[PDB]
Every structure is written in structure tokens, then in C-alpha cells.
Design a protein around this nucleic acid. Sequence first.
RNA 1: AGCUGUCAACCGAGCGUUGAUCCGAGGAUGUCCGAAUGGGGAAACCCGGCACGAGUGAUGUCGUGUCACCAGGCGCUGAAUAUAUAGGCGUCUGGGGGGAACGCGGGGAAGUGAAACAUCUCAGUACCCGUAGGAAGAGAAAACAAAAUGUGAUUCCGUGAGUAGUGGCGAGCGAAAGCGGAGGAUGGCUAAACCGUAUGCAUGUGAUACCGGGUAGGGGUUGUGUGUGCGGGGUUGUGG
RNA 2: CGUAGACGGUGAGAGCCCGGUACGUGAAAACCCGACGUCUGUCUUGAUGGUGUUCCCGAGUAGCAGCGGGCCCGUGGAAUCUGCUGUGAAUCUGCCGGGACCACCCGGUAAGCCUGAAUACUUCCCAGUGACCGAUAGCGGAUUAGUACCGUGAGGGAAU
RNA 3: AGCGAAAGCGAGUCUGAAUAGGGCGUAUCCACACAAGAGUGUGUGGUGUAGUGGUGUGUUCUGGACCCGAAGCGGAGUGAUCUACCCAUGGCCAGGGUGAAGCGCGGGUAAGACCGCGUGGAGGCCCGAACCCACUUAGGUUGAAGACUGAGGGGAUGAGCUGUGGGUAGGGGUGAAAGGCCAAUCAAACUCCGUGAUAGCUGGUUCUCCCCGAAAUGCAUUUAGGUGCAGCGUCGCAUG
RNA 4: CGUGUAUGUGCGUCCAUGAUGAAUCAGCGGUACUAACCAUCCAAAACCA
RNA 5: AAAACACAGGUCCGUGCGAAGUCGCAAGACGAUGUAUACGGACUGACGCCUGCCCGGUGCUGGAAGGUUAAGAGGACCCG
RNA 6: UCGAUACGGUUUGUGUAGGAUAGGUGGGAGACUGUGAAGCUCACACGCCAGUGUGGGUGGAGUCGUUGUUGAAAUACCACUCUGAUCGUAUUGGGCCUCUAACCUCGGACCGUAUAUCCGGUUCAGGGACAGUGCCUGGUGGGUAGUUUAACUGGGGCGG
RNA 7: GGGAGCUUGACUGCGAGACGGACAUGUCGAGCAGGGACGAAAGUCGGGACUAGUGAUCCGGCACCUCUGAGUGGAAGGGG
Lengths: 63, 151
Amino acid sequence: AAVCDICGKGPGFGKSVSHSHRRTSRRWNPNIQPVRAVTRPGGNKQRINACTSCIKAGKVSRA
Amino acid sequence: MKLILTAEVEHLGAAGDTVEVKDGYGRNYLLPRGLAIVASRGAERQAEEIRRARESKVIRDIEHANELKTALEGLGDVTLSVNAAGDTGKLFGSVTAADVVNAIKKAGGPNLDKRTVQLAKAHIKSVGTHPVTVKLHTGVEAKVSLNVVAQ
RNA sequence: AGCUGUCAACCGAGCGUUGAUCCGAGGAUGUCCGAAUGGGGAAACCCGGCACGAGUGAUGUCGUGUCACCAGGCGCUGAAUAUAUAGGCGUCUGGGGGGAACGCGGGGAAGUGAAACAUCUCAGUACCCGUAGGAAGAGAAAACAAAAUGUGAUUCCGUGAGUAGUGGCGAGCGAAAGCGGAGGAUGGCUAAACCGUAUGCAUGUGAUACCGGGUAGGGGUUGUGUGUGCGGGGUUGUGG
RNA sequence: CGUAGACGGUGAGAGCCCGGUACGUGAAAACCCGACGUCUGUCUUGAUGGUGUUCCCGAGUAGCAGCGGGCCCGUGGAAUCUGCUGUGAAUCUGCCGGGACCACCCGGUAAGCCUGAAUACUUCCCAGUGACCGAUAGCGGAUUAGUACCGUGAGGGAAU
RNA sequence: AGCGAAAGCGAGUCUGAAUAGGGCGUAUCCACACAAGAGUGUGUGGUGUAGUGGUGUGUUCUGGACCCGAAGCGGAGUGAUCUACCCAUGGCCAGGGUGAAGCGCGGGUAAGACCGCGUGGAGGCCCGAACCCACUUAGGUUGAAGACUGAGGGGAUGAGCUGUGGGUAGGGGUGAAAGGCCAAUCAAACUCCGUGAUAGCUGGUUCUCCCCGAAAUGCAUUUAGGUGCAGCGUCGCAUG
RNA sequence: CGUGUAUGUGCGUCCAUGAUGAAUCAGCGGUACUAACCAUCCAAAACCA
RNA sequence: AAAACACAGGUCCGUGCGAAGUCGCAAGACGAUGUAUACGGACUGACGCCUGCCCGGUGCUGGAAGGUUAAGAGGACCCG
RNA sequence: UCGAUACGGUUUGUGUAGGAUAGGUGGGAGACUGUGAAGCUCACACGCCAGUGUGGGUGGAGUCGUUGUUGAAAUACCACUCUGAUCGUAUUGGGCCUCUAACCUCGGACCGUAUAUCCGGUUCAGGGACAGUGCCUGGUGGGUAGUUUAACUGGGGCGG
RNA sequence: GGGAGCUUGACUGCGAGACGGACAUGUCGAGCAGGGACGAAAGUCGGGACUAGUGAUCCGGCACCUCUGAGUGGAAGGGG
Ligand SMILES: [Mg+2]
Ligand SMILES: [Mg+2]
Ligand SMILES: [Mg+2]
Ligand SMILES: [Mg+2]
Ligand SMILES: [Mg+2]
Ligand SMILES: [Mg+2]
Ligand SMILES: [Mg+2]
Ligand SMILES: [Mg+2]
Ligand SMILES: [Mg+2]
Ligand SMILES: [Mg+2]
Ligand SMILES: [Mg+2]
Ligand SMILES: [Mg+2]
Ligand SMILES: [Mg+2]
Ligand SMILES: [Mg+2]
Ligand SMILES: [Mg+2]
Ligand SMILES: [Mg+2]
Ligand SMILES: [Mg+2]
Ligand SMILES: [Mg+2]
Ligand SMILES: [Mg+2]
Ligand SMILES: [Mg+2]
Ligand SMILES: [Mg+2]
Ligand SMILES: [Mg+2]
Ligand SMILES: [Mg+2]
Ligand SMILES: [Mg+2]
Ligand SMILES: [Mg+2]
Ligand SMILES: [Mg+2]
Ligand SMILES: [Mg+2]
Ligand SMILES: [Mg+2]
Ligand SMILES: [Mg+2]
Ligand SMILES: [Mg+2]
Ligand SMILES: [Mg+2]
Ligand SMILES: [Mg+2]
Ligand SMILES: [Mg+2]
Ligand SMILES: [Mg+2]
Ligand SMILES: [Mg+2]
Ligand SMILES: [Mg+2]
Ligand SMILES: [Mg+2]
Ligand SMILES: [Mg+2]
Ligand SMILES: [Mg+2]
Ligand SMILES: [Mg+2]
Ligand SMILES: [Mg+2]
Ligand SMILES: [Mg+2]
Ligand SMILES: [Mg+2]
Ligand SMILES: [Mg+2]
Ligand SMILES: [Mg+2]
Ligand SMILES: [Mg+2]
Ligand SMILES: [Mg+2]
Ligand SMILES: [Mg+2]
Ligand SMILES: [Mg+2]
Ligand SMILES: [Mg+2]
Ligand SMILES: [Mg+2]
Ligand SMILES: [Mg+2]
Ligand SMILES: [Mg+2]
Ligand SMILES: [Mg+2]
Ligand SMILES: [Mg+2]
Ligand SMILES: [Mg+2]
Ligand SMILES: [Mg+2]
Ligand SMILES: [Mg+2]
Ligand SMILES: [Mg+2]
Ligand SMILES: [Mg+2]
Ligand SMILES: [Mg+2]
Ligand SMILES: [Mg+2]
Ligand SMILES: [Mg+2]
Ligand SMILES: [Mg+2]
Ligand SMILES: [Mg+2]
Ligand SMILES: [Zn+2]
């Protein structure tokens, strides 16, 4: 759920920073959404995990 | 999202109108249903061609389907193809469903959609008469004989 | 010209001037286990299919090939179900595991220091994950510089400098430009505009079209949109 | 004797006893480095002006915003670089850098790719060296050594 | 070549309204003037300024940093063949007592309730071996044994005991709950690695002679058995 | 548990003995296209107060 | 080895169903091939007679008329 | 169903000199009428019940201008606008009801499939722009983690 | 010590020479100049008879200044 199946977009790693400046490890996960994508006009759908960026760019399509 | 309509949808516009909709509206409804196409270099021409083609190709009732069947089975058609040397009979590729549809029309026949042509099942790989089934409706299948001929 | 590895002799037998032992190179053979891969398993031991051959009166038995899984070409088939697709057959080509260090990209401590401690330090260290190559990474300016008529890809070494700075301005941390060297390739190829061609998807039966005039004929849909592939053209900063 | 007085060995300090040493010489085969061909590409019309509110010049990109990472730089007036999440441009009057930002000048031409040398390292193989150790030393291991032995196991681990 | 926060100026410069007074600087000395006895200063002349690069020694900085020693803290692995609990499948429990429900018969009644007599064989039932425990006591206490032996003691058809095979793993497991137990080690196992962890603490630190020779006070301190500076030692230079 | 050969009894594909069962033409009643018959319910347009 | 734990019995609270709870980053699993006469958690501890008063404090449950309150919106005015 | 702005239009202005509830300003000596005015009878809005705008019927040939006043004129007519009331065209936010198409279903059936309470696909039946999940943000947070919790002292603690 | 008149020295630039002393702190000071108060003048006045009424450094705020301004002019930021 943190890896896109089209572009390979993975999570980033970094730090959450407290007011007292305590640095704790955390992830920045990609916003990936389940999409029932198609392959040809009017065809069978297949569930894939696509990031919102790919959906916005039209790299996945629906019917 | 910028779209050109190919049908009349209420509260949006008429066939041929350019409209800007929300991405969810076009990507999940208008474009899947073929009510619109993405605005593009040729989209005005393509949208008008799509809508006019639809009205000609649409089938309505089982009675219209039986009329189409009884007309269509009364014909034998010619499909023109580019092919290897005659002993092989091999075609330099494959007859498409669009070829079968345009051949049926060119031979004074109905204007059917290409998804009704059961071409894969016909297994046309050589040249000669090959029967192809056209599924007008769930209960109405017509059989057509195609000559495949070297161009 | 002596040999039959050695601890390691002792016995018992033999080879070598018709070149032995020995030394170098290339082949042959190479049980079983091991990624281990016909199936199974407590690694090195249990049980098979198929093809060919051997052996039996026949069964049993014995050789020698071949049979995992996944990924990617090519062919056939195309469920629910119509288009189809998922999948299923067949076949070819690969991958799998190991290795002391060195590389690159990710993940990432604590003891400790701060004479306590959380920011900070230790340290992007230890360890871990993914992958290399004989090296790797980087590399051909959307660079520096400061009005000098400047330099001119990257990497690496020496300096600049324990400096500018940074820092519970604590403990500590710490450049770059510039200059001197190593190397020589201040190296190359592409995307678009615009021609040509093939072909996918829409149309069209009339204009169009057929390299372009001036034409003279002709041929008649060869057309007309738009996408993709393959050839020409184009590789640049004084902009090209 | 010496182009040989390296270093060993030989019954005690050996250039002349032995293996050697200086110096020369040698490869059927395989492998490696060349050169030369074949063979494969590629090219064969180039120079020269003009002209223009003409077209093109790498888009979910740049930019911007939020939260981070990393830069001498610990969020700081914080540029430059970079991840995730939103938003989202212009094709040269363009755009991006010259430490907030603006103007003016200067430099450069992002969102395509490839690229040898100078640099790092040594499991293993060959030739050598030491004001290095000489058997409680030197490798844990000069002796059946990762052996005996200890532990369920990871692992620990001698002595001669 | 210094002074200044700096622009900057320069044997001067900074502060300042000062040609005021100070600060810092103009190597060091000598002579002579001219002002001061408010500590001497200000001008002329002379004399001229010493650094830097090897290398020995002492101390110091970053590194294990003179040597030995924790309890503990991380990272990655190894362990349920002991023990805790669970899962699957087997086995075992001499002998002797007691007498629930139910059933049958006979009293009793209008029918019952109820009451005798049989039959029956219930139960975390009773006594007691195997077996499983470990209550009391004596012995053992460089043991026969890193938890045992003798004598008695408890449970002993059940929440029983036990074989085989299996499962749960460390801030985790399991626990009829004692912080119990998790391979003779558990208020966070074991092993390797970070690692030569860190100890204001304890111990240790190896041949000689010659000269000199302390302190145990003051001030400050997350300080009081630590440390900084001063005081007191020594070596060198200067001043006598 | 398998294997081969031999011998003897019955059981049979083709021959044949026994065995069943389904399409279709034609003579008849109640479903029932459809115009009507019978029983029953309602008022558009609506007459009257 | 007990007076501690467990126990049958009691009350409260949670849970309407891949429930609540628990293991896991997730998928998934146990709960349970169960369904409120069930399942989980808490305290009490056969049985008999009983279990009084306090909702100020701190939890839990429900409510939202006021006071206060994030990012996101807005973008006056001001400054270079 | 509200709420901001914009654009088409309409309502509505008690210094006093007064024909008098003086809009500031420009074109301003002529408008407004038979596509039917002066003068009334009613409906509607405001109200300082002074009186204004307006629809229909009726009436049938005017009110009018520097008119003198007045800082400021004509309610004769035309232009943008302002104290404020409003309606429709856009733009843009808040709440609420629905719809299906994203998304969701450990609901049914069917297929991949001989085997299959996995998984995937198809379809039907339900949820539904909610939920879930990114990013950003405020709470609850000994559930867990790293740590801190002074010294002097006639031993320490307590007291000081 | 008590009373009264005027006033702001409860100053700006400075400071020979000392006290005190681990260090950091602390303390006294004649006198020179500017611009002032009181006084006829001499003169006195850099808070209060004297010794307590206080807090290092860092970081940051505000006012002012002929300082700096990361290519240049500005600005931000930084100095005094
Ligand atoms: Mg990181
Ligand atoms: Mg840390
Ligand atoms: Mg969107
Ligand atoms: Mg095998
Ligand atoms: Mg296997
Ligand atoms: Mg199909
Ligand atoms: Mg590999
Ligand atoms: Mg510390
Ligand atoms: Mg310490
Ligand atoms: Mg490379
Ligand atoms: Mg510095
Ligand atoms: Mg091309
Ligand atoms: Mg240029
Ligand atoms: Mg010698
Ligand atoms: Mg470009
Ligand atoms: Mg950072
Ligand atoms: Mg910039
Ligand atoms: Mg590269
Ligand atoms: Mg010896
Ligand atoms: Mg040794
Ligand atoms: Mg052990
Ligand atoms: Mg062993
Ligand atoms: Mg600790
Ligand atoms: Mg440990
Ligand atoms: Mg294990
Ligand atoms: Mg009993
Ligand atoms: Mg016990
Ligand atoms: Mg004894
Ligand atoms: Mg006993
Ligand atoms: Mg007894
Ligand atoms: Mg007893
Ligand atoms: Mg008993
Ligand atoms: Mg029983
Ligand atoms: Mg086990
Ligand atoms: Mg206790
Ligand atoms: Mg134990
Ligand atoms: Mg611990
Ligand atoms: Mg370390
Ligand atoms: Mg130590
Ligand atoms: Mg003495
Ligand atoms: Mg001292
Ligand atoms: Mg006991
Ligand atoms: Mg209960
Ligand atoms: Mg749940
Ligand atoms: Mg309770
Ligand atoms: Mg109790
Ligand atoms: Mg509450
Ligand atoms: Mg939502
Ligand atoms: Mg704690
Ligand atoms: Mg610590
Ligand atoms: Mg104390
Ligand atoms: Mg005391
Ligand atoms: Mg006290
Ligand atoms: Mg007095
Ligand atoms: Mg004062
Ligand atoms: Mg002084
Ligand atoms: Mg004092
Ligand atoms: Mg004066
Ligand atoms: Mg004075
Ligand atoms: Mg006084
Ligand atoms: Mg500080
Ligand atoms: Mg500047
Ligand atoms: Mg700049
Ligand atoms: Mg400033
Ligand atoms: Mg300042
Ligand atoms: Zn993606």
C-alpha cells in the first residue's frame, strides 16, 4: 500500500521533530489508491495499486 | 479537464460542445461511457464522427436484430488483403474486425459495430471463403461468408 | 636415471634408455550431497514418470538420456461471455547460489562525550537490506566568477583552514571559491519544428490525390483527419 | 675466476665442492597483447547571403505551498540541492542561477541518454624485502588445528 | 606594522567637540636639548631590531593513550531435548470399602405426597500399593548427589499421572500469580558484534646514584574522598 | 501379493437368443387467440333539488 | 505449601457480529465454524442472613446553551 | 437551503429663506400626451401615518422654466452614482436531501478449476462520494521509551 | 540633626593615583573640557551621614549612529 504498481513510487524516510527538537524516524508514504483499471476500451477490469499522481496523469483508465 | 461532447447530456451541453468538467466527472463517467472525448488537435472532427457513426450503427430491438440478420445472411462479401505467395496463402498480418464491418457496408449491407464480429473464432489465417458469425443480439446470430482475396 | 605421494618404515610384488617417476599445457572420466532443480527428506538417502537399449519363460532387475520453479521471446487455444481478456497447452532463451576487500543506492543504534541530561555528540559509525564492476560512482555547464578583454566536463591528491562560519554559541562541529598537481577525450549520441514511407483507428466515393511549376494530356478514390513505428532533417547560447 | 664476492647447502666462517648467481638461451599447445589484412560500417555539393507579431527547442515538468532530509549553516533574514503531499507555467520579449527579496547587468540553456584516463581494494597466484617474531614469542594454529575438548544451539576453543 | 566593531587611516590609530585625557602600538639602548619634580614626559639625532626550517627532550591535543576490573546499554542471531502452558495421538491407575440417581416390589391414599425392602453402582467419594507429590524430622553440608538419603507424611477415576510428535522467544513467551519459569544462570535468557563500553572509584606501574624538596590552607564548585586558580616545591632566565 | 506356461469348465463381440421403449399420421375434450353470452362493480359527460 | 492462588456462586462494565478483546506494519488469525441463556474484561469468592449514607474530588456515560481553541480558508492595512 | 462579491434593473434623501421630506453633479428652454395627461374611487410597499412610488378602472387636454427664493433646481427631460430596501443574470464559498459512475462489501451465483470457505475475474444484490487510505492539523496518550529527582550535616533520614 | 529660597550635578566626554584580591566581580578618586544649578564671591554639585535594597554569560527586544550591505544600486540580515 506504499508502493505504486505503475511508477514504483516508494515511501520516503525522514524525521518528525518535537517542539523540544526530539527527532523520531517516520515515513512519508505515497498516496496510492486501489483502482479497477482497464487495458482496452470496454474490457475486463483488474485491481491495481496506483498512486494519485498516476491517476491524475491518466496513466490508469476506467470503464 | 477539457472535453468535447459526442452526445447530449443534461446540465452539461449538446453534442459537439466543449466543456470544462471536474476530473472525476469525465474520467469516471463521461469518458468510460463514450459520451465525451478529451479535447485534442482533431477532437472536434472526431467527436462529430463518433456521434454520427453511433446513430447509424445502434441496434434497438430484437425485431430490428432479426431484420438485420435476415438482411445480412443474404450476402457474400469480399475482403481485400495483402498476402504472401499463393502456395502459403498466409496473409501479411490479419483481417481486422474493422475490415469485416467496412466490407459488409461496401457490399450494400447494414452498418454494424465492430465488437459484434466474432473474428477471432473464425481463425482466418489463409485466403478463401471463411464464415464469420455476427452477434446482433444475445439470441440473434447471423452467419456471413467472406472471400479473402489478394490485393 | 632412477621410480611405485606422505606420517613411515616393514614386508609383498613390479615398472624404466623401446625414456619411467617427475614438471607444464590441453582433453577424457568425474558416485552421492549441496542453488540442487523428476518427487520426497532428519544434507550426503528414500521413491518414481517417460524415451531408447540390455536382461528374464514372464514378472522382478540393470544401463544411458530426459522430467523443478519463475521471467522474457515465438506458436496454438480464448472461461464465466458477445468483443475479448484472465488462464491453459507447446517450444526456445535466460535467471536462481557462492566469494576476503574495494563501489553505488537504501534502512540505521547504543555504550560514550557533554564531569547529570533531553537539543547536540558518538555517527551516517556498528549492523542490516538491494545491487554491481574489475574497478565503481561522477562527467560534457539551466557551472563558477565579479565587472578581470576572467576560467571553461568529471574524478582524485595538496593547499585555502582548524579559517569563514556553525554550536543548550555548551561539549563540539566545520566549508567553498581561489591557487598548485595527477589524467588526458575543452568527448559523443539523441527529443521536437519540417519532409518521406509503413501501418493502427475514424471517416469519405466527392472534391481531393498522383514532387513542383507553366502546362498539355491521362488515370479515377489512390483521398481526408489523428495516433504509432522506421528512414531524411536537427543538435545550439554571440542564441540555435 | 669474476658481466658471477646474491642467498642457501655440504661433517665447523666456501666466488673457485654442490643448487645456483651474472649473463645468455628456449615453446608443440593453450591463453594474452599487438600489427596487417579480409570483413563491417559511413560519406560523397557544398559554400553563401537575406527574410519574418511563422513554427520548434525534452510537462504533471519548472515554479509555488505544507511537512521533512541534507548543505559550514541545529529554522535561522535561509538562498542552492532533495523525498512525500497538494497546486500547477511559459518555448527565447522564454526560462533558471549570481545566499531572503526587487530592479539592472552577468553566467547558463533544466525537466533524454552514453562516456576512457588520473582514484579505491587483494580471497587467490608469482618474485622479493625487514635496525619484524624465534616456540608462554610470532597467526588461535611450526606438532592430525578451527583439531581435541566444552555447549541443545549460535558459539567458545587449547596443549605438544 | 599597527590601531579600529567596521568604513578606514597608518608610526600612528581608536574614543571624543577637543590642538583634552586615556587605551593599544611605534625592538632595545645611548647622547643632546625643552618642559616636569605629579610619579617624569616631549622632541631631535644616533645604535639598529630576528626570524624560520630540520631534529632531541618535557608537557599537552585527537585517538584505547600508563595497565587491569564492573553492574549494565545497543545491533544481529541462537535456544521450549530443562521448565511453564497449550495442540494431536497412545498408555497407566494392585486390593479393599461406601451405597446417589434411576428402576422394581410391597405399605399408604380417592389419586398423590410420603415411608419400608430389594436391585442399581453415582462420586474433583473413603482406606491403601504402583505412580505422582515434598508436610515433619534426622543425616548429608571439600556430599554417594551443584538439592540427595533414611524414617514417618499427602494425592492416588481425576482440575489425575505419563510416553511419543508438535506449537508459543526476550520488553517477548508462559504463569490455578511465587516476579514463578523460559537448558544447574531471570525485576528482562544466551551468543557474537559496537568493544580495549564507561567507572570523580579500588588495585597495579619494573635498574642506580647525586642536588633541591613540599602540602593536607584560601576562594569557587550539582561541590565536600573530585577539580580550577591562588598559596607552598623544583628547573631556567632576569634583578642583586 | 505378483508373473509365465499348460489343462479343463462354463460365459461372447459377427452369427444370434431374450428383452424392452420412442417419433409420427388420423378419430376425440378444456386451455383458449378472438367477435360475442352471463353475473357483478364503478361514473367521465352528467339530468334534478 | 500457607491464612496466598484457583474454585463453584454473585454483581458491574463492554460487545449486534470477518462483534468487543487480543496477536500483527498490513493481509490474516484467535474469539467461534460461537451470536446477548453468547463472548471479553473487572472486582467478589460454597452456603445462610444481609449488603446502610455520600456524585463535592477523580474516572466512566450522555448532552451542547455559553467561554476558549489547530491546520485550511480569507487577505484589509502596512513594508521592500 | 443559506452567505459573500460582481452585473442588469428598481426603491429612497424632514439646516432654513420655501409653490417644499432641497441628491451632490454635468447635456438643460423645453418636456410629458392620444401606442390616451390634469381630478378622483380601490389593491400594495414604507412610515418621521408629512406623504411618496405603483397596477387597473374612471376622467379628457394639463403640470409647466430664470420663475423671487436658494451656498445647491426644478418633481420639465437625460447621464454614472452615493445614506440604504431589493429582485433576476454570473462568480464563489457553508449546510441539507437525493442520484450512480469512483470507491467499499467475510452478501448470492457463475468461471479460471479435475481438485479449492485462498485468490482473481464476471455478474446480480446492497452500501456510496460516506467509509477506508496518503499528506497536513488540534486533542487523549505511564500503553511504551529515554531520563531527571542538589548540597551542607559531629553516619544518613527528618528538621534547619 | 531642625527650617527656608532657588534648582535637577539622580550630568555628557574623561580620569593622575590608589583600596581590595585565585579569578570574575567590587570600591575610592583629585583634576581637565562641554553644557548647567545655587552662591556677592571663594567655591560646592558625576544622587541620598556611611556600609545592604541584588544576578555573570548566552539568546533576544526597543531607540539612536557619518559602520557593514555576498555581481552592482537598494533591501533583508548583521555591527556600534
Ligand atoms: Mg534519511
Ligand atoms: Mg539521538
Ligand atoms: Mg484532481
Ligand atoms: Mg532433489
Ligand atoms: Mg523439495
Ligand atoms: Mg469470448
Ligand atoms: Mg548473485
Ligand atoms: Mg554525559
Ligand atoms: Mg563521567
Ligand atoms: Mg560507469
Ligand atoms: Mg570561527
Ligand atoms: Mg524521427
Ligand atoms: Mg549568452
Ligand atoms: Mg654465503
Ligand atoms: Mg532544454
Ligand atoms: Mg536540514
Ligand atoms: Mg535566486
Ligand atoms: Mg551514467
Ligand atoms: Mg626455549
Ligand atoms: Mg603459539
Ligand atoms: Mg548454554
Ligand atoms: Mg556435542
Ligand atoms: Mg539507562
Ligand atoms: Mg545484551
Ligand atoms: Mg527457534
Ligand atoms: Mg478421591
Ligand atoms: Mg511441585
Ligand atoms: Mg560432615
Ligand atoms: Mg520418603
Ligand atoms: Mg500411615
Ligand atoms: Mg491420612
Ligand atoms: Mg489414598
Ligand atoms: Mg466416576
Ligand atoms: Mg519441540
Ligand atoms: Mg513480592
Ligand atoms: Mg533455571
Ligand atoms: Mg534492560
Ligand atoms: Mg566505539
Ligand atoms: Mg577503564
Ligand atoms: Mg635538604
Ligand atoms: Mg593546583
Ligand atoms: Mg517446603
Ligand atoms: Mg461468572
Ligand atoms: Mg476487531
Ligand atoms: Mg467495576
Ligand atoms: Mg478475595
Ligand atoms: Mg466527557
Ligand atoms: Mg472522507
Ligand atoms: Mg518510565
Ligand atoms: Mg544514555
Ligand atoms: Mg549528603
Ligand atoms: Mg544529623
Ligand atoms: Mg529536609
Ligand atoms: Mg541637614
Ligand atoms: Mg540614576
Ligand atoms: Mg586605574
Ligand atoms: Mg559593598
Ligand atoms: Mg563648567
Ligand atoms: Mg568632582
Ligand atoms: Mg540629606
Ligand atoms: Mg548557554
Ligand atoms: Mg548586494
Ligand atoms: Mg546577490
Ligand atoms: Mg538595518
Ligand atoms: Mg544591536
Ligand atoms: Zn505511480
